[PDB]
């Protein structure tokens, strides 16, 4: 007896800069040109 919420759902839509997912390309694309903050050497 172990049940109640599932957190958020799932979708083959995710983002490579981050860990966002979203229910088409479209509003994937618009987001992954948002992502301006990461510049230089600095990764990992
Ligand atoms: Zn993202």
Redesign the pocket.
């Known amino acids: 007896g172990s049940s109640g919420s599932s957190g958020a759902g799932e979708n083959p839509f995710k983002?490579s800069?981050?860990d966002?997912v979203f229910t088409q390309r479209n509003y994937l694309v618009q987001?992954?040109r948002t992502?301006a903050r990461k510049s230089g050497p600095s990764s990992g």
């Open positions: 983002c800069k981050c966002r987001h992954e992502h």
